[PDB]
PDB file of C-alpha atoms and ligand atoms in Angstrom:
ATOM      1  CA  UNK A   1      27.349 -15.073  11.406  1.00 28.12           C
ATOM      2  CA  UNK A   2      24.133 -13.250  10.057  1.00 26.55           C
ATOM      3  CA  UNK A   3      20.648 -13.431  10.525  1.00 27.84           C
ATOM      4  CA  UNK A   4      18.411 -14.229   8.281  1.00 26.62           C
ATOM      5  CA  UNK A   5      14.888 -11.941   7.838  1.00 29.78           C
ATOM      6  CA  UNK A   6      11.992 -13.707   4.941  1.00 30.48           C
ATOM      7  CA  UNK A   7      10.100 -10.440   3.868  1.00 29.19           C
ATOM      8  CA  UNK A   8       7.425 -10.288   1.689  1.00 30.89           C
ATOM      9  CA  UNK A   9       5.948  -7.551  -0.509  1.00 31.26           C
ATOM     10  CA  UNK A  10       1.963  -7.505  -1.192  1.00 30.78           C
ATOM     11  CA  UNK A  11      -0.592  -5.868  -2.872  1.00 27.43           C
ATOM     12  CA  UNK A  12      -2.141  -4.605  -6.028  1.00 26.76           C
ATOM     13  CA  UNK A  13      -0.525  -4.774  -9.330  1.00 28.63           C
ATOM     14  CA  UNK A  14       1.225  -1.563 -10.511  1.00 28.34           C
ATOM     15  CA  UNK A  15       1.613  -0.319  -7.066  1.00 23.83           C
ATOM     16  CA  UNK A  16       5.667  -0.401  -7.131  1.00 25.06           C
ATOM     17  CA  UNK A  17       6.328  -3.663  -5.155  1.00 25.76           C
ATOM     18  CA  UNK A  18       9.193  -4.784  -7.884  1.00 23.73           C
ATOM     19  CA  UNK A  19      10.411  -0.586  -8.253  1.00 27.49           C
ATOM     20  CA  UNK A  20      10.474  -0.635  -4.168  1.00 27.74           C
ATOM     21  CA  UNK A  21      12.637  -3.695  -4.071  1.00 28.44           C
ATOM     22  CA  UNK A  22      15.130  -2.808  -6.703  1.00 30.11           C
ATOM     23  CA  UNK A  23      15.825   0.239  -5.018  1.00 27.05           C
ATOM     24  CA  UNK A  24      16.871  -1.623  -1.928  1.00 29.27           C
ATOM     25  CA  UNK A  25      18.509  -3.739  -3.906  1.00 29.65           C
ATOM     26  CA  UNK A  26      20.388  -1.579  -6.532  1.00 27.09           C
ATOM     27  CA  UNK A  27      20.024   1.638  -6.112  1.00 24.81           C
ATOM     28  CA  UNK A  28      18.325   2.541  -9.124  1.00 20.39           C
ATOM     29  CA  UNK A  29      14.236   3.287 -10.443  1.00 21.42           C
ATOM     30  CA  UNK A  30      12.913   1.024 -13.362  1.00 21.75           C
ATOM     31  CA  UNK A  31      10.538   2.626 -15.283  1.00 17.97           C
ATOM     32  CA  UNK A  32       9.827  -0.923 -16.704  1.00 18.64           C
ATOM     33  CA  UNK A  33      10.113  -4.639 -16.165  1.00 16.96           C
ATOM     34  CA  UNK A  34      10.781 -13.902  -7.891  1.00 18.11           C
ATOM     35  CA  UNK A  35      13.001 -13.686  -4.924  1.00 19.57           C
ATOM     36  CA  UNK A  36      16.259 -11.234  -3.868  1.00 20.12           C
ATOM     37  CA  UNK A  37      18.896 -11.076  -1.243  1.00 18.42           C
ATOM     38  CA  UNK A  38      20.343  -8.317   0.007  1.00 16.95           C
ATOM     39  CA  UNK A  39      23.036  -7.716   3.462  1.00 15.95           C
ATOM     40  CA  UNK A  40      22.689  -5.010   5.562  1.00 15.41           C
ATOM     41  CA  UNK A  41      23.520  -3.845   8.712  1.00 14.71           C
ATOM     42  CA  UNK A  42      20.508  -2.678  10.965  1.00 14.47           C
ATOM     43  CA  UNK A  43      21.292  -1.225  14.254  1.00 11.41           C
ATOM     44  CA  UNK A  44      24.718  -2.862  14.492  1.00 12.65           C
ATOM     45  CA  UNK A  45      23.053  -6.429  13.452  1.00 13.86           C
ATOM     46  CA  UNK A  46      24.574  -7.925  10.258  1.00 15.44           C
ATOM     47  CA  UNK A  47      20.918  -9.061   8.676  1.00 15.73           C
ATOM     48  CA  UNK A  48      20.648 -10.641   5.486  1.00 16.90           C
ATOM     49  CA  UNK A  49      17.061  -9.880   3.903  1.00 13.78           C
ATOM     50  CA  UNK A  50      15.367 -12.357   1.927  1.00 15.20           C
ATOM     51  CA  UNK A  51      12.894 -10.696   0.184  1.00 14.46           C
ATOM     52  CA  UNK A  52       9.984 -12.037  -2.140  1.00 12.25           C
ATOM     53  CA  UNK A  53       8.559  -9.302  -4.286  1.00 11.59           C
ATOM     54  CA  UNK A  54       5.448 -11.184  -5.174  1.00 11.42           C
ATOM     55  CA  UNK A  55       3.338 -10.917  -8.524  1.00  6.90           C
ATOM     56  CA  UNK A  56       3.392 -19.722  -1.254  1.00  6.28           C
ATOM     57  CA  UNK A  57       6.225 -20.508   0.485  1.00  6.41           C
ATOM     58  CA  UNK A  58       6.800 -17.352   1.407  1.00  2.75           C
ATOM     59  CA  UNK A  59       3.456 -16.664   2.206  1.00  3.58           C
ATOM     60  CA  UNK A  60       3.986 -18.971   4.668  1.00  2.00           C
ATOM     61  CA  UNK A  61       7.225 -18.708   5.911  1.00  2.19           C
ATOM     62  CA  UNK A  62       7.431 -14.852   5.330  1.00  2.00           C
ATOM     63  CA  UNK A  63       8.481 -13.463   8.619  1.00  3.33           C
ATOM     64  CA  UNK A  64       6.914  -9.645   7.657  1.00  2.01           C
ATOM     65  CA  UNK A  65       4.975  -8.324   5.068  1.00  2.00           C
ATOM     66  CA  UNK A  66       5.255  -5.032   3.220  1.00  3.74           C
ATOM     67  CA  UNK A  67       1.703  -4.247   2.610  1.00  5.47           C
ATOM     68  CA  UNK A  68       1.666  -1.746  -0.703  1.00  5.48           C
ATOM     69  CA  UNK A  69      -0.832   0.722  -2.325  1.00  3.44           C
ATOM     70  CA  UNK A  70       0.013   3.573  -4.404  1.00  2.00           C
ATOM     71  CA  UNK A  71      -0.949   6.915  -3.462  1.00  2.92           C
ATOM     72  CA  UNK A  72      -2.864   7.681  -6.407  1.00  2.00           C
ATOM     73  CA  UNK A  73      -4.652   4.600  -6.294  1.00  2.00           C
ATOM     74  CA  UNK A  74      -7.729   3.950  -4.135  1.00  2.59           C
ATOM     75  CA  UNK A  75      -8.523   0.966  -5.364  1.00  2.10           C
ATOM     76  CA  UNK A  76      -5.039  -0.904  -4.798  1.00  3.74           C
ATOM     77  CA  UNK A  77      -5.773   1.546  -1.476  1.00  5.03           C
ATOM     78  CA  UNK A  78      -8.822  -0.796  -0.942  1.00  6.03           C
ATOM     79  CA  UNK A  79      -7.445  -3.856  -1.507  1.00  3.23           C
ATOM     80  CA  UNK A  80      -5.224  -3.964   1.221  1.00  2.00           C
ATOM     81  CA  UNK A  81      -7.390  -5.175   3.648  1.00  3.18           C
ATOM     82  CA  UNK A  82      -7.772  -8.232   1.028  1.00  2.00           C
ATOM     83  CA  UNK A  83      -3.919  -8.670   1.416  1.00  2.72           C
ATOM     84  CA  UNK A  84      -4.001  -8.359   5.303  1.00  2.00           C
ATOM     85  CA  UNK A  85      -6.814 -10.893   5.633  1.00  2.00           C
ATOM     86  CA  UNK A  86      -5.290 -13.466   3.081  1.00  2.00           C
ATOM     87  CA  UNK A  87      -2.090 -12.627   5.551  1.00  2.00           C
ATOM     88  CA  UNK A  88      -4.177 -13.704   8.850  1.00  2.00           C
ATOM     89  CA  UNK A  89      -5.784 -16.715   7.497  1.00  2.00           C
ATOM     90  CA  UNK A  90      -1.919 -17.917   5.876  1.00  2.00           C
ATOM     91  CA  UNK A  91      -0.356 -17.255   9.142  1.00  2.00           C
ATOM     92  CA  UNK A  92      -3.204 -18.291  11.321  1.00  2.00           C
ATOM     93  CA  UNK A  93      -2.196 -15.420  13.359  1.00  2.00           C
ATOM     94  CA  UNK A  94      -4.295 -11.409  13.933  1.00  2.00           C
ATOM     95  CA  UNK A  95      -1.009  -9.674  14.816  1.00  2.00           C
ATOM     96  CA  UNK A  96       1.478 -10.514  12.073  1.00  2.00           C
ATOM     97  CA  UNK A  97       4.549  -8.118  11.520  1.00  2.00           C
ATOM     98  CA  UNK A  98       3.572  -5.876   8.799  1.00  2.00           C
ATOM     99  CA  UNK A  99       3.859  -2.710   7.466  1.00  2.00           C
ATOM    100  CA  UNK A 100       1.690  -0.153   5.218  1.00  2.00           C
ATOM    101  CA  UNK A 101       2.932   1.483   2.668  1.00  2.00           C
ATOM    102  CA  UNK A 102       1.572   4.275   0.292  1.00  2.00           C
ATOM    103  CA  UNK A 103       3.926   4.336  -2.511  1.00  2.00           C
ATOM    104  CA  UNK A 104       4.184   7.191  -5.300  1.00  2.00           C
ATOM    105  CA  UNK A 105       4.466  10.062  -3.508  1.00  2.00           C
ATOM    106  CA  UNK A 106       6.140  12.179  -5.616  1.00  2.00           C
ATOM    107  CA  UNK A 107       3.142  11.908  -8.375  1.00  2.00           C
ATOM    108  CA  UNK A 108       0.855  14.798  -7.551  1.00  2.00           C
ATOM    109  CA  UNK A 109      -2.557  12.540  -8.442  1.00  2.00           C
ATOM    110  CA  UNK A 110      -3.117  11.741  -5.386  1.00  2.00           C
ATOM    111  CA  UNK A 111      -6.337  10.326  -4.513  1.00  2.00           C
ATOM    112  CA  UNK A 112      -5.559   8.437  -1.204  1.00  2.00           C
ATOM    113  CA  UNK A 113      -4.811  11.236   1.565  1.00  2.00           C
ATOM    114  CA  UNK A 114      -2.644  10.489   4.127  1.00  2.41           C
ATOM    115  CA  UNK A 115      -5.458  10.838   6.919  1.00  3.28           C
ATOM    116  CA  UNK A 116      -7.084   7.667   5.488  1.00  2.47           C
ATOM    117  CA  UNK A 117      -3.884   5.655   5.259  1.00  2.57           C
ATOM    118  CA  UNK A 118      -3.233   6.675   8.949  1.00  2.00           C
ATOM    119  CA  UNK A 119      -6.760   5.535   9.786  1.00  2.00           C
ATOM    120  CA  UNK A 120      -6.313   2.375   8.321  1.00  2.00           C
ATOM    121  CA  UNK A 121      -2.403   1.655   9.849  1.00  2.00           C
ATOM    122  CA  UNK A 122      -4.114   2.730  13.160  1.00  2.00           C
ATOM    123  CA  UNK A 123      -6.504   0.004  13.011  1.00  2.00           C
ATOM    124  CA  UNK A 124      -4.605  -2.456  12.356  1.00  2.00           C
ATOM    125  CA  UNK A 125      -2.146  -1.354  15.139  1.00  2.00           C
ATOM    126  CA  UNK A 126       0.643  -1.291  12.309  1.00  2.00           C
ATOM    127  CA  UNK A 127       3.471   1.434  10.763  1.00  2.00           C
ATOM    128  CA  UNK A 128       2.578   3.455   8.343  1.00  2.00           C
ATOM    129  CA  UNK A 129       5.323   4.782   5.808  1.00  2.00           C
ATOM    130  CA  UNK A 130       4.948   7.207   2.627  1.00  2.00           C
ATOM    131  CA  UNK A 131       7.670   5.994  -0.208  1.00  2.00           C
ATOM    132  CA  UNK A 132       8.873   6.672  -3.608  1.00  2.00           C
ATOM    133  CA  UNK A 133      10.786   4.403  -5.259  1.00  2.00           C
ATOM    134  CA  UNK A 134      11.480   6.932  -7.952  1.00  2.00           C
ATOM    135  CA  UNK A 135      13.274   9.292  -5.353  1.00  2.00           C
ATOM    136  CA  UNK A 136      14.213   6.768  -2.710  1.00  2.00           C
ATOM    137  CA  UNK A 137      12.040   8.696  -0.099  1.00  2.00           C
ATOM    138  CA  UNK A 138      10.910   6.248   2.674  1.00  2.00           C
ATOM    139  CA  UNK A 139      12.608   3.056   1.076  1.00  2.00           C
ATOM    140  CA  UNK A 140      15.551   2.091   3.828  1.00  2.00           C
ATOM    141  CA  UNK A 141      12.612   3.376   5.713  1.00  2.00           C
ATOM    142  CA  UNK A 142      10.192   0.893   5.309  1.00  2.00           C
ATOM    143  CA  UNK A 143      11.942  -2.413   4.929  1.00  2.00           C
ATOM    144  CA  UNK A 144      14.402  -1.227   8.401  1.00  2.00           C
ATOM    145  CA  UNK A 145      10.880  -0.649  10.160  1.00  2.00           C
ATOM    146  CA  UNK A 146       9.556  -3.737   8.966  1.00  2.00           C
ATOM    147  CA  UNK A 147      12.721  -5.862  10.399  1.00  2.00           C
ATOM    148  CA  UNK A 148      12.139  -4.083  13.587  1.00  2.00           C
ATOM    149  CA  UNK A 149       8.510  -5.129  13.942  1.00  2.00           C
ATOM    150  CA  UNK A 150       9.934  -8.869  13.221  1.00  2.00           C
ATOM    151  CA  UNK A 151      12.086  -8.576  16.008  1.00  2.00           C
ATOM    152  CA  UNK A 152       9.625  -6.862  17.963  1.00  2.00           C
ATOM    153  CA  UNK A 153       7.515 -10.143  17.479  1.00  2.00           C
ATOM    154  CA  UNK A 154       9.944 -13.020  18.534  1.00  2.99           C
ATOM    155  CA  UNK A 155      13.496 -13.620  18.574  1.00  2.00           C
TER     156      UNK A 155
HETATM  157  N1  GSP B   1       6.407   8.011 -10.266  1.00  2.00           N
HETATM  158  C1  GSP B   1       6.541   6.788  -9.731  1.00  2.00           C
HETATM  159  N2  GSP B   1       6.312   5.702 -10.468  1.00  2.00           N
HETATM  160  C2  GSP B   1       6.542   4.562  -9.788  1.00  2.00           C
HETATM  161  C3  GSP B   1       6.933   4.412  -8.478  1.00  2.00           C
HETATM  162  N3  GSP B   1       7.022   3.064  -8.140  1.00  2.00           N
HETATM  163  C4  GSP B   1       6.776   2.422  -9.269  1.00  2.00           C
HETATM  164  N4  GSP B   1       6.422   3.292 -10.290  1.00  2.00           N
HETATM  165  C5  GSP B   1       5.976   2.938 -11.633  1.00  2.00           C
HETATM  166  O1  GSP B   1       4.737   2.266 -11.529  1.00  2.00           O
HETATM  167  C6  GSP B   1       4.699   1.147 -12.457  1.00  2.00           C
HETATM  168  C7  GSP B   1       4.479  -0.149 -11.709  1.00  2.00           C
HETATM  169  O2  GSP B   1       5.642  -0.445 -10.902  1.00  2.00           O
HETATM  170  P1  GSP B   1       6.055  -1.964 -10.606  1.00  2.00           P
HETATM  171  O3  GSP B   1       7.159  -1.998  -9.606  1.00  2.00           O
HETATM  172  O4  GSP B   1       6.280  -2.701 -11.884  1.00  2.00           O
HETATM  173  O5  GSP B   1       4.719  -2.564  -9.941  1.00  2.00           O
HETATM  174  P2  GSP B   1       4.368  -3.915  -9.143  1.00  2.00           P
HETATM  175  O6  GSP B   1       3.548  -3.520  -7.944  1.00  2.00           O
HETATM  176  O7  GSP B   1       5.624  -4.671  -8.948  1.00  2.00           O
HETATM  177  O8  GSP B   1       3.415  -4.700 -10.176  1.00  2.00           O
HETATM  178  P3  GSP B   1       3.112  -6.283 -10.517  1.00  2.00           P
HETATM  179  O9  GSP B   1       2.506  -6.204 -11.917  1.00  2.00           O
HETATM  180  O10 GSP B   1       4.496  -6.895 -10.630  1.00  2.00           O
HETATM  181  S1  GSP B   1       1.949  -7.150  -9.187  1.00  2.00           S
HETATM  182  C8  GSP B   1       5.998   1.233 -13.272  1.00  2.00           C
HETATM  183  O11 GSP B   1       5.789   1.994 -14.455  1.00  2.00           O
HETATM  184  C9  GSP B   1       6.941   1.985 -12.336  1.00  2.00           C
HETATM  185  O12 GSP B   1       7.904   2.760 -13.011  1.00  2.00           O
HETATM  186  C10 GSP B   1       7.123   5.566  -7.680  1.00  2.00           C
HETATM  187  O13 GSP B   1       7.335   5.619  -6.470  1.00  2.00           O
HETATM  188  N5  GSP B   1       6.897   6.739  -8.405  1.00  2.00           N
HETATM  189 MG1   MG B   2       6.491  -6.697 -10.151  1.00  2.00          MG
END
């Protein structure tokens, strides 16, 4: 009676991958700190989200991919197009459900601008969405859009 939805959270270390996924799950922002279930209803479907925060399985039997930088961070910023690659080669696949994420926006050292990060989404003909996990800005956000581009993809 629910459907099931493997997500999987790249990218650099210290971007907020874990802080982004313990808000979803409980509500909360570590300051300091494997895999995590969580049920939730997206437009009127009853979805349970199986989500590996990582940092193979699930590399290759993630359905979508939260793709992480941090904001004031241009070389996690840089590195996504490592994690999008490793993504394509995993899933043997150039058009993957996945969405980019620029994390920390509520710190004001912000070295990525938003310009570039739309740039980059653009290319890669993918969402972009701003977050905090400290504030909860963009969270629901970013994991709802990222089950919508799974079901955009297949059934
Ligand atoms: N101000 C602020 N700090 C954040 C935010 N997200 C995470 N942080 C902080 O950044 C640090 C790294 O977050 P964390 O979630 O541990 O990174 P990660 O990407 O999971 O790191 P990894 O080592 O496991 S591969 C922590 O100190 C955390 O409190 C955010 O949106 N705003
Ligand atoms: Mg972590």
């Amino acid at each position: 009676h629910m459907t099931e939805y493997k997500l999987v959270v790249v990218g650099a270390g210290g971007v907020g991958k874990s802080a982004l996924t313990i808000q979803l799950i409980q509500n909360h922002f570590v300051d300091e700190y494997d895999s995590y279930r969580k049920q939730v209803v997206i437009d009127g479907e009853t979805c349970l989200l199986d989500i590996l925060d990582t940092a193979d399985q699930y590399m290759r039997t993630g359905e979508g991919f939260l793709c992480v930088f941090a904001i004031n961070n241009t070389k996690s910023f840089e590195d996504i197009h490592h994690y999008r690659e490793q993504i394509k080669r995993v899933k043997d696949s150039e058009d993957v459900p996945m969405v980019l994420v620029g994390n920390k926006s509520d710190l004001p050292s912000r070295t990525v601008d938003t310009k570039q990060a739309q740039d980059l989404a653009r290319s890669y003909g993918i969402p972009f969405i701003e977050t905090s996990a400290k504030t909860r800005q963009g969270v629901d956000d970013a994991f709802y859009t990222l089950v919508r581009e799974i079901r955009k993809h297949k059934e």
